[PDB]
Amino acid sequence: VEFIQPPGSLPSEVLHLALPTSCRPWLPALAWYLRQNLLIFLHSPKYTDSNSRNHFQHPLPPQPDLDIYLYNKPGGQGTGGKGVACITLAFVDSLALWPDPLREEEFEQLTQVAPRLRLDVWEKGNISIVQLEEKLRGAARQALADAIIELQLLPASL
């Protein structure tokens, strides 16, 4: 774990994601959706480690909970490289203190991407940070859309 993680230099440059303020009231639920929607190719930061020190270093205090994100190295035929990290992202300008319809033609306003979402990882080489950033943007947008469809469209009865 520490081979790819530079414990002194925690980040591999920062990544801040800006979310619409309209999603502020339901901040924690979104997190769960994110904590779900990210786990497509992301893998849990769990190993044969009966200690938090053996687990990947997390330069992000909890908002016992929380975890990090691990990405396997992509590549294969043609383009390739060695990429591994431990991303411990958080939302800041704290969801612990946290517990009319909208039109269609005026949509994409709530889906446009006021709490920011800071992200920092420990890069291990060939990562193509632009691809990871756009993947993060898309995943966050999908998770927010899922949370919206669950919060407001679902409870309506026929």
UniProtKB/Swiss-Prot annotation:
Tissue expression per record: Expressed in the brain, predominantly in the parietal and frontal cortex, as well as in dorsal root ganglia. Expressed in peripheral white blood cells.
Q: Please give the coiled-coil regions recorded for this protein.
A: none
| Recorded superkingdom | Eukaryota
Compartment(s) where it occurs, according to its Swiss-Prot or TrEMBL record: Lysosome membrane; Peroxisome
- Disease named in the record: Developmental and epileptic encephalopathy 18: A severe autosomal recessive neurologic disorder characterized by lack of psychomotor development apparent from birth, dysmorphic facial features, early onset of refractory seizures, and thick corpus callosum and persistent cavum septum pellucidum on brain imaging.
Q: What does this protein do?
A: As part of the KICSTOR complex functions in the amino acid-sensing branch of the TORC1 signaling pathway. Recruits, in an amino acid-independent manner, the GATOR1 complex to the lysosomal membranes and allows its interaction with GATOR2 and the RAG GTPases. Functions upstream of the RAG GTPases and is required to negatively regulate mTORC1 signaling in absence of amino acids. In absence of the KICSTOR complex mTORC1 is constitutively localized to the lysosome and activated. The KICSTOR complex is also probably involved in the regulation of mTORC1 by glucose.
Summarize subunit and interaction data from the UniProt record for this chain. Part of the KICSTOR complex composed of KPTN, ITFG2, KICS2 and SZT2. SZT2 probably serves as a link between the other three proteins in the KICSTOR complex and mediates the direct interaction with the GATOR1 complex.
Protein's UniProt name: KICSTOR complex protein SZT2
Q: Which organism is it from?
A: Homo sapiens (Human)
Per the record, the gene is SZT2
- The residues of the intact protein that this chain contains are 2208 to 2396 of 3432
